[model samples]
Target chain A: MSEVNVTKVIVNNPICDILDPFVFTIEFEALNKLEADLEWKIFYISAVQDIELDNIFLGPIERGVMMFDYAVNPPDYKNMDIDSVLGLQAILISANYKEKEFIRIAYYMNSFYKDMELRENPPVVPQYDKICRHIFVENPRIVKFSIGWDS
Target chain B: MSEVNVTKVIVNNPICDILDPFVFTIEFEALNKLEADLEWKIFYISAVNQDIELDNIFLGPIERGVMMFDYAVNPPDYKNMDIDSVLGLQAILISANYKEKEFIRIAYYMNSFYKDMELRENPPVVPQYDKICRHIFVENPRIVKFSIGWDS
Candidate 1:
């Protein structure tokens, strides 16, 4: 129905608890089909929930919202076996993150929102999340294996 | 009363409807007196109707949910509402095949549709109407949608 594509799986940290590794690919059908901008805000949520994201603002949608940028390990076509997708594989890291819960990802066009909040205190934009679409990640481990040999 | 504030009125598009001027201010008192990351999400709406906001979702507290930002331009200082913010809001209000009814539908979350599904897939809490007001449309149509996550 919706023209959103997930082209890569970048994080598969099933063993570590603190700042477990995570990344993924997201491609939208068209720019107009998106609400805010091209940046994705990653959240390590404790539970799985739903909200009407179509009509809410996640604070001011500006570059300032990007507290900082963390480098992502570029997809390795050799050792880690995954196809190279068209768009970027956005990445995130979290401390004390368990593999049991879900992750919430918000994506929007960064340029559009950055243009809005030139001042430090930007006027709160309503429905700022309209351009944002949430992707909830749950137990996305590509490989799950318990290390107990009962032979 | 409630700790929410409506800080400014930046848009008075009475003269023109084609992306007319708009702006506003908003602030939130510390929930339990802290400015740490809040769970509230703010929405700019065009119509005021009732479906879910204060009633259903916030009935109890949970670890996850969104909160509304509570800030306002005090009437005396409303003149100070920033211009850049106003134009930004204006730009979005008119962009991406903008539709008036779409905003209306967003306000209600298609309550006509979502409510049915909500019972089966209930969040820790869901939004219900306050019953304080019924479908009252104001002169200017801008609105905000705020929700928060429980801490306990």
Candidate 2:
């Protein structure tokens, strides 16, 4: 198996979901790039990882990357946060290798990405969502969440 | 105890050894700074164990902080092959807690930080190194050295 690999990718915002109170709905067409190459034989995304972190790195390792993703509610994203609606984020796409029994991913960032000029307003533009890359992991893993209301 | 904690820090450079190669080193300080409160600390490093990670999340649950001061190396030190030298690699200084365990690291690029004028050879001002949010995990590591002697 290769020690290190890299690739590049693009994330499509297929659906829009309301985050309530702040943002109604947001959708994007982003990319997920990998540094390592993959075999054409394997098709389809084997895994997808998402995370919102305290720090969002935007450069190379050492300091690692830059953490500049703005939060819709408060803090760093506010000062740097240009528009409100539709949280901005980058996606990671990867395929699994059965022989190695391991999932390899790419290196990516939304920091370089420019926001949709159309989304420069409040409530509508305030998707109130942001993504960060302070996260660290090797292979892909399963994630779960729940939503409940009390009456 | 909570598996993860966060904090900021200020770092110092390592002392040069006489026996080391003639590599250009930087005299600068670097650290993990918390953008929230602007507080700083040091490392709470530990080893990695089999833990279930969350999807969309980059870093999995860490048992503790990773190892620190374990060797003559730190996380982001640059080893230039052409120069045949490694420069600007320092470890972290910490407090009593894991969150405040800030890693005090130095980089080759971080030199002359004490001076206002940063001679950026690259066109755009280079971006700060991304170490804070990005998790640096060392795993099943192996290196094989190859050589063809002058026996022909």
Candidate 3:
């Protein structure tokens, strides 16, 4: 069992442009004192590969409830092929201790073209800029793992 | 020794409108007489995961017997409630204690949404709070029991 109980993980925008910036708010209850800093990361995942975007690190967290916000920019899908652009996607919120990952909260994300014509008939080059990413924050998969935690 | 036991914590109308009142019935049994009051609290968990205590109810100096009662709290102010938190899956917690030594925490997820087809299909960037309905999953409440010292 983990001493750190994650109570809340809220993404500011459930739907946004592929290049929009967003924030994630994390709320947790610490049953015991932790001496080391906790590293938090946000990752964008697709069928082809996953890209880790941004991170937040907080340390020496004491027992009790604490909440904070983590900001992030759009996923950098740089150098990836156009075929890797749309369809089913995912966003992950993870918390780590001493580089040993211990928490994972993932949500379903879908990327699609808003324009019907553009979606049905595509040019030689992909209109990656028109992709709108929607995150289904309504349902999420929350998991915790045992880690090397020092008090 | 376990001097006190909670037999039940019932939340009524778990699935109701957002403006509806929150009602609950608590049943507890005590083996012996107690001298201090037990404080019960309800906390609303935000989508961002903040547990904001909404109200506190006190159960008095006791006798050796069983007690049951009902309580009602007005809906939290819309201004204080976050639209994102209420519009989707979130949680609410119920807990109680003697001398601030909490003994139990009961939590259940609440899923609130708009019934209107237009609103449901095309959600507003800034929500229209009045149109949302709140539903709590009381059947499968997540409960936690603590080993706290009791002085009677």
Candidate 4:
């Protein structure tokens, strides 16, 4: 037998041959100079077919490692449309596939969550004077599963 | 005429106070013998009233200015519970209710998102990497209705 070489899933497509090599890139610029003069941020990200975050089968990026493996390339550069720059951050995540592991990979996030077991409380916030200036997460980004797809 | 103070929401006849003020006080051992070990974070925070991220309406904490101007309190100081630390967060968002101009007084995450925003572009991996996290946040926590009392 040829060892039944399997392929990963990316954008709902399996890997027959190494195409695009699934590039995962991240770039961010703090100063986005354009007509808008928006001093926010610009993020550039790319993923191959087997990339973890690019697949709908996966839940959130938190459990990306458990659900699927990440792809490492020779450190490539990303090209932008040359519009603006604001605290730029870019990252690429790619993965290889295996047909038999499709189901496992598909439910990787859920599986990882269910398997997670911890026994400990969190730390206590340090006491400070009217230090009410602590709570502030600009564009706080939280991740969770909207629903479970176990079939 | 004096202005009426707003309160938190009430449901199931619980008569929940509107924007009620609550205090949190806890004591733990110092870093000597029995270390104070407690994790705190915001997880699954939603605008219980409108499915809005609480931080959106209330805003986040600021390095400068009044703390109240910000949304919640300090960042998840507790290791595991940083994301879902409600004590640090606001019980109710006054800005969401009155849209009044005031300094934010709560904690707000940076590069953090709630719904699609979190998943958009580069997915935030805090949940995976961090020890604690908050999922959803409710939205819109104010209502104003006009009616006749006695006489004009």
TM-score of each: 0.17, 0.18, 0.51, 0.18
Residue-wise C-alpha lDDT for candidate 1, range A1-151, written one tens digit per residue: 2122223333222111122223333322221233333333343322112221111122223222122223233222232212111112222322111122112333211101111222224334322221111122322422222321112
Docking class of 4: incorrect
Candidate 2: residue B56 lDDT (0-100): 13
List where candidate 2 sits over 4 angstroms from the true fold. A1-90, A94-132, A141-151, B1-93, B96-152
lDDT value for model 4: 0.22
Give the per-residue lDDT digits (tens) of candidate 4, residues A35-141.
Answer: 21111111223220122333322222221123233343311222222111111222222221221221121211100000001101111331111111111122223
Please list the residue runs of candidate 1 whose C-alpha ends up more than 4 Å from where it truly belongs after superposition.
A1-88, A92-142, A146-151, B1-152
Alpha-carbon deviation at A54 in model 2, angstroms: 26
lDDT-superior candidate, 1 or 2: 1
RMSD (CA, angstroms), candidate 2: 23.1
Query: What i-RMS does every model get?
Result: 13.7, 14.7, 20.3, 17.2
Q: Which stretches of candidate 3 lie over 4 Å from their true place?
A: B1-152
Candidate 2 lDDT over residue span B1-152, tens digit each? 22222221112222223122122111111133222221222232212112111111112122233312211223323221111111122122222222323223211111111111232233223333321122111111111222311112
The CAPRI class of candidate 2 is incorrect
Provide per-model DockQ scores: 0.01, 0.02, 0.01, 0.02
